[PDB]
Amino acid sequence: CGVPAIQPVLSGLSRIVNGEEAVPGSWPWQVSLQDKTGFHFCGGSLINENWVVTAAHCGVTTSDVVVAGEFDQGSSSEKIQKLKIAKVFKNSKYNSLTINNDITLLKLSTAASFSQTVSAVCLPSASDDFAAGTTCVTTGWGLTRYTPDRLQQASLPLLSNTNCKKYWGTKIKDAMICAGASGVSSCMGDSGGPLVCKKNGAWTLVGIVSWGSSTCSTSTPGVYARVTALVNWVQQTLAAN
Amino acid sequence: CGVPAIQPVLSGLSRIVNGEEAVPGSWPWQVSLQDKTGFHFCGGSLINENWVVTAAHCGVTTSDVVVAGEFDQGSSSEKIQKLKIAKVFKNSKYNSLTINNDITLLKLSTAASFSQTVSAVCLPSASDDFAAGTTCVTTGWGLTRYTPDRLQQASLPLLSNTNCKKYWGTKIKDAMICAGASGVSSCMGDSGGPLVCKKNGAWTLVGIVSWGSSTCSTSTPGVYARVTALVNWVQQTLAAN
Incomplete structure (x- = not known):
């Protein structure tokens, strides 16, 4: 890593x-979180092939998508991986008013394929x-x-x-x-x-x-x-x- | 109502x-949303005895509590109802960046008891x-x-x-x-x-x-x-x- x-x-x-x-x-750990329509709304970090760590205030759901290996959001030519989310784990101590303990884990439905441009x-x-x-x-x-x-x-x-x-x-x-x-x-x-x-x-x-x-x-x-x-x-x- | x-x-x-x-x-529809430690972090509105409507960006979970019938948060003398949340329904079109379609429904585990100070x-x-x-x-x-x-x-x-x-x-x-x-x-x-x-x-x-x-x-x-x-x-x- x-x-x-x-x-x-x-x-x-x-x-x-x-x-x-x-x-x-x-x-290479940097990912883009996008809604089901392709709209980028948050970032996150791969910590292994099945897990992304992000902020709890992003409110990610299982219908959002993890996009790994991206550099240019305006490009359709570069290699990317659009990874479905199986389950969202919000830290129970998160507080949406103070924004303390602002951490959420995403478990992917299928592992990312690690490469030169995708790793933890x-x-x-x-x-x-x-x-x-x-x-x-x-x-x-x-x-x-x-x-x-x-x-x-x-x-x-x-x-x-x-x-x-x-x-x-x-x-x-x-x-x-x-x-x-x-x-x-x-x-x-x-x-x-x-x-x-x-x-x-x-x-x-x-x-x-x-x-x-x-x-x-x-x-x-x-x-x-x-x-x-x-x-x-x-x-x-x-x-x- | x-x-x-x-x-x-x-x-x-x-x-x-x-x-x-x-x-x-x-x-009387005004409720307080509090964390499992009693900390007030959001508001909401009763729309019947089993449902509260609030904002999606509040990030409410089933370990948070709906407090109905409250007037003075600093008082322990007034009659209140602390209502557990059974399930949280976030509008799937919510977007935590633009904050559009910012609505979530809470279904209570047990109905609120409506009264002079608690209604929809x-x-x-x-x-x-x-x-x-x-x-x-x-x-x-x-x-x-x-x-x-x-x-x-x-x-x-x-x-x-x-x-x-x-x-x-x-x-x-x-x-x-x-x-x-x-x-x-x-x-x-x-x-x-x-x-x-x-x-x-x-x-x-x-x-x-x-x-x-x-x-x-x-x-x-x-x-x-x-x-x-x-x-x-x-x-x-x-x-x-």
Whole structure:
């Protein structure tokens, strides 16, 4: 996990404004969630061939579809996999008002076929420490909500929850982690999309997109579900299902 | 339906600022949705003894609870009914990005006991016309998200979808209706709470709270699911279940 066959290329432009276009296929766990009519409404991350992790506030249902291996949403020429969803597992501690414990697992009806452009992100262990100041990366098509149709990426630093509260106040709970406010927007991340940090040569999922600045401010950090706080629930869910 | 045993009292103060406190029990279809720990996160409306209608973006589950007959959330002295949810019916056309077709039905495990303070709102027919300019009412505890712990009410006018788009642009779809921008906030309405209009001596559910001004502006209208566009789905759901 966490080692793309097509290596990401992150330049200085990933650190400012609205980030930059990713190398096609270089974020191979990134999926698009689409409705039964083909409309893209959320992102997510493959954690193996049968499971996608996303945000609970996406409200995914079994009639939505997981699209893997995509780079250009406006293209009909590239190879993609449209994967039906068999069952949706929402974390029971999710709260649609505070948006805390904002994590949902999707079990696919048929496994994805992993390839150079389709593979899994690594999960952290519950006791992993991703220190404030660590540079991490968010990816997605989030800018299309407001524009490039190809997958974008941005590099941005983790904040302590104390410092994040200077921006978002009592909205920040223990099961959340914030990133950004360093001169780049977090808006390229779709709801439910990944925030990954590279430790020990592998990209690890540290956050799942919950919300960000309503104006995509380069000085307001994004807010993410804190995966280390929820990974024990993820592993219990996989083991029981 | 739509005829409270305790008649509402709506004064001039319901038309300005953040509205006014309701007469206790005078909005008897109004319910509170709470999590398994007792935390209030959404509103809804009883449409009979076994069914509550709310917003799909509330993400209600069968472990949440419907609380009927409540006036003061900070009180343990008033009579209430905590009603378990047997099954949740989300409109399949709901879209968590555009928030269109934002309606969900809750079927209770055991019927509510209707009384002076607990009874049903009326539903419109699909072809009913609630003209722009009609004065309607929204109720709820929405102000507690930001403060009075008792149920509030505000009177505000319906807008045409054309005029609503001057405020919210292409966010406004046919299955939405807007109300307000007349000197009063819409923020007293909880997510999923009612917008009712009185035609022929009965209060009819015209809207369900979807979103409003992020700053509770008195000059920005609230956006609601348009019940006339969704009532055929409601009736099919009740008849099949």
